[PDB]
Amino acid sequence: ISSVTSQSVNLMIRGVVLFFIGVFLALVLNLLQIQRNVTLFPPDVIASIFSSAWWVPPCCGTASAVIGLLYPSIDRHLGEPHKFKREWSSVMRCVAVFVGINHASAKVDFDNNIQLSLTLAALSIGLWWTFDRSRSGFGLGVGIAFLATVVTQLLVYNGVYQYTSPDFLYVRSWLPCIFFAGGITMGNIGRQLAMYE
Amino acid sequence: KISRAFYNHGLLCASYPIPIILFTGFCILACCYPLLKLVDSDRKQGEPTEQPEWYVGAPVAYVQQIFVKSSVFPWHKNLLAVDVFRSPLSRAFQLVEEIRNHVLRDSSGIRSLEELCLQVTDLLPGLRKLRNLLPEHGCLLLSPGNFWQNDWERFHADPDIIGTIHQHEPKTLQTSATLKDLLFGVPGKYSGVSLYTRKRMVSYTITLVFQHYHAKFLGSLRARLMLLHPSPNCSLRAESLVHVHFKEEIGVAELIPLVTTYIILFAYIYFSTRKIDMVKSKWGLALAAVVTVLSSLLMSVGLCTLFGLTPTLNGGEIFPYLVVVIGLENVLVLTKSVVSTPVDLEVKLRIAQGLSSESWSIMKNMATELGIILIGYFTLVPAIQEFCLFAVVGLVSDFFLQMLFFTTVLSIDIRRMELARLAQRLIMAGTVVWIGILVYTDPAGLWRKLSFRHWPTLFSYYNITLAKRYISLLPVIPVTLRL
């Protein structure tokens, strides 16, 4: 029984590993947008970093673990594992791009919707054209991004997000690309990490 | 059709290796020259004279502070900060009511402070804790009795104030100082205002603001204070005006993500080269490709700025992303093709055999990248019509260069290798230049006894930032003594 337990070890081990990773990311990335909070009793340093509350990072990383343990096992059970570019370097490239785009999430201002379609279609498509040609991960990342979009768009209707203005299109145009990219990145992570042994 | 070209190119490189090394290194230095070092007169501190005039630069409002000190006999009874402080304010309130209602033949006949005093009631949200401490009618004057809404009767009728004034001191050593020390002015620790018997020097700091200075008012006012103050001091100076500079602080968290990037980047490196630790050769081999691509982007920056076409961007925040995009497989795809070749003499032939074969694919990959980037530039978005140019230049440079410098490094390397040191020394020097341009990532990292701050705080409280602006201070004194 020690063997299958060592298997379960490897399995949830990698999950905790990339859970910490998803957290690290969400922290850094929330911190990216620089709000000017002039208010009295200015913020203490760690509070400026550890923003929001315990609600956010555990969920973000739970999603990462879901993804990393999902994308490899599906191809383990359906077809053959992946081998296109699967060495850490390309994983790191994907991660850096995932970071850069989100850094482009706020510091641009577009002319017209056609410019956003014409460019984001190509961008998302490429980020699958380059690090995973699997149709499976494609149709799965698209799905989970769809659903993250919908859950967000209906939860704030009760209210977590707390923004309400003509900018209601940002979400309907920009974020699903983020989560799309995130699913794919985390997938390549899970692959490169599980095919160690 | 073309492999003959790259074939002769290998004949050319190993034939004239070192001159090519010189050309490339010195153009590298020609591009990495300016960046790491490179109608207003002087926005920074430039004090001239009180009898003078400003730089005539608005948004810049000057505040005047008044210092006053009370003394009791080295011997007295019931020394408490209540009674020794009240009579000072017994006079302070009279002085406030004189200045606020200062009747005098100013430029506007019988004028008062209000006519030019910064009149504005911009009360911001977070003022809840002090909805009764700052003026909102139409005056900008700060005194400790402000807490009492300009009521001296309440002041000299209350049971106690020490705790009440304490009421808003949260904690110790906070960058946002307080409101108490402000309307005291004199820092109870630097001024030394402590409940000490037979050695006490209580002081009250007063503040004021204005747009245009007219000494026709203030000099005549001082004519009143020469009689009102009547203290024993020689302070008088002459004419010297000080203009404090408003420096803006980039916090730390605002800095974190950038650094994350660089961390990621270094990993992209260590992992590339583990592909090369396999083959029989030294570590520095890998070095050659590292310094090169980088030196290219750096080089690119130099030719991207001076032409005059990067007016809104820096490298420390973008440069990595290129090392991410174009990558290094474009130099190892051929390296492995070289070492994979037969062990023959005159490497000039081995490389012209393998590199010649991989030329086709390298050109295809290049044209692919250029298609991508040309699509981007075709877009009318301007910030991308910028970055695409960084890209194209870094790319064409990496290409037009790698065949020259790295190719020659490999030549001399396998020369010294199959046979058995300007090469490694010039390599170390290129790496020093690289680490230097790296430590030059800062391009994106960009009276006086008073505190470091609490000057902008006031303006921060009114949807107004004074970081761009400058402030000036002039002083007057009025002190008292009795038993």
Ligand SMILES: C[C@@H]1CC[C@@]2(OC1)O[C@H]1[C@@H](O)[C@H]3[C@@H]4CC[C@H]5C[C@@H](O[C@@H]6O[C@H](CO)[C@H](O[C@@H]7O[C@H](CO)[C@@H](O)[C@H](O[C@@H]8OC[C@@H](O)[C@H](O)[C@H]8O)[C@H]7O[C@@H]7O[C@H](CO)[C@H](O)[C@H](O[C@@H]8O[C@H](CO)[C@@H](O)[C@H](O)[C@H]8O)[C@H]7O)[C@H](O)[C@H]6O)[C@H](O)C[C@]5(C)[C@H]4CC[C@]3(C)[C@H]1[C@@H]2C
């Ligand atoms: C699988 C993994 C899991 C984890 C993860 O990866 C995948 O999931 C991802 C996903 O989950 C991510 C999140 C998705 C949602 C993101 C939202 C984003 O906030 C949004 O930022 C946008 C930036 O464009 C908009 O803000 C506008 O941005 C414009 C572009 O510059 C501004 O120009 C405009 O300002 C307004 O411009 C017009 C003028 O007329 C106005 O005067 C001026 O204000 C801003 O809009 C407003 O701008 C203001 C000033 O900057 C405030 O920012 C305000 O916000 C409100 O400010 C109020 C002030 O009191 C406050 O009370 C209130 O609460 C705030 O809402 C904001 O609206 C928008 O609007 C604002 O929302 C935030 O940056 C990052 C964000 C969170 C992301 C964090 C990182 C994540 C978690 C990712 C995370 C890694």
Ligand SMILES: C[C@@H]1CC[C@@]2(OC1)O[C@H]1[C@@H](O)[C@H]3[C@@H]4CC[C@H]5C[C@@H](O[C@@H]6O[C@H](CO)[C@H](O[C@@H]7O[C@H](CO)[C@@H](O)[C@H](O[C@@H]8OC[C@@H](O)[C@H](O)[C@H]8O)[C@H]7O[C@@H]7O[C@H](CO)[C@H](O)[C@H](O[C@@H]8O[C@H](CO)[C@@H](O)[C@H](O)[C@H]8O)[C@H]7O)[C@H](O)[C@H]6O)[C@H](O)C[C@]5(C)[C@H]4CC[C@]3(C)[C@H]1[C@@H]2C
């Ligand atoms: C094919 C694939 C695609 C994907 C990719 O690969 C290939 O392509 C690449 C490409 O996509 C890349 C992105 C492209 C866009 C890039 C944009 C760039 O942002 C720039 O960052 C600069 C930093 O100095 C400036 O931003 C300033 O940053 C300061 C420091 O934080 C702020 O302090 C200030 O904002 C000020 O804050 C205080 C307020 O009081 C002021 O009101 C406000 O201004 C900002 O400056 C502001 O930045 C704004 C950005 O929109 C405007 O420039 C604005 O100026 C005015 O803005 C108005 C509205 O836009 C405009 O109408 C007006 O004319 C302008 O005068 C300017 O004040 C500048 O500005 C801003 O651009 C960012 O660093 C990297 C970036 C994200 C890139 C990341 C990596 C990528 C993703 C790459 C990616 C791999």
Ligand SMILES: C[C@@H]1CC[C@@]2(OC1)O[C@H]1[C@@H](O)[C@H]3[C@@H]4CC[C@H]5C[C@@H](O[C@@H]6O[C@H](CO)[C@H](O[C@@H]7O[C@H](CO)[C@@H](O)[C@H](O[C@@H]8OC[C@@H](O)[C@H](O)[C@H]8O)[C@H]7O[C@@H]7O[C@H](CO)[C@H](O)[C@H](O[C@@H]8O[C@H](CO)[C@@H](O)[C@H](O)[C@H]8O)[C@H]7O)[C@H](O)[C@H]6O)[C@H](O)C[C@]5(C)[C@H]4CC[C@]3(C)[C@H]1[C@@H]2C
């Ligand atoms: C794996 C990845 C995931 C992500 C992704 O890839 C795969 O998935 C893809 C997919 O998911 C895409 C989304 C699909 C849904 C898309 C919806 C789309 O909205 C529609 O966009 C159209 C243009 O393509 C029209 O928008 C008009 O755009 C013009 C500018 O070009 C404006 O000019 C005009 O507004 C009007 O201009 C003229 C003035 O005189 C008017 O005063 C003014 O109103 C707009 O149209 C208006 O736009 C407004 C704000 O956007 C309102 O929506 C309004 O609503 C109207 O309200 C009326 C009320 O009586 C009603 O009668 C009428 O019917 C409604 O239309 C609508 O008119 C239309 O209009 C608007 O809706 C948006 O542009 C892009 C969109 C988000 C897409 C973003 C990119 C995606 C994510 C893709 C993305 C790559």
Ligand SMILES: C[C@@H]1CC[C@@]2(OC1)O[C@H]1[C@@H](O)[C@H]3[C@@H]4CC[C@H]5C[C@@H](O[C@@H]6O[C@H](CO)[C@H](O[C@@H]7O[C@H](CO)[C@@H](O)[C@H](O[C@@H]8OC[C@@H](O)[C@H](O)[C@H]8O)[C@H]7O[C@@H]7O[C@H](CO)[C@H](O)[C@H](O[C@@H]8O[C@H](CO)[C@@H](O)[C@H](O)[C@H]8O)[C@H]7O)[C@H](O)[C@H]6O)[C@H](O)C[C@]5(C)[C@H]4CC[C@]3(C)[C@H]1[C@@H]2C
């Ligand atoms: C398929 C699966 C689905 C699920 C999932 O995986 C894939 O999908 C992913 C995706 O879906 C993700 C979500 C997408 C939407 C995201 C929305 C985002 O909200 C934004 O978060 C930003 C973070 O900075 C800003 O929030 C403000 O951040 C400021 C600092 O930068 C604070 O300053 C301010 O709080 C203010 O501080 C000063 C005080 O004076 C104010 O009183 C207070 O407001 C904050 O804004 C506050 O944010 C709070 C929660 O973080 C509250 O919302 C609060 O509003 C109300 O405040 C009341 C105070 O009494 C309180 O009682 C009440 O409860 C609150 O509602 C709101 O002001 C911004 O502004 C806000 O928009 C949230 O951070 C994370 C978020 C949800 C994400 C979490 C992780 C996910 C889910 C992922 C998840 C794993």
Ligand SMILES: *[C@@H]1O[C@H](CO)[C@@H](O[C@@H]2O[C@H](CO)[C@@H](O)[C@H](O)[C@H]2NC(C)=O)[C@H](O)[C@H]1NC(C)=O
């Ligand atoms: C207080 O901030 C507000 C909101 O930014 C500023 O008022 C606005 O001015 C800007 C452009 O300068 C616009 O974005 C808004 O449309 C304006 N809205 C208004 C007038 O409510 C205002 O400039 C700031 N106030 C002061 C004193 O500077």
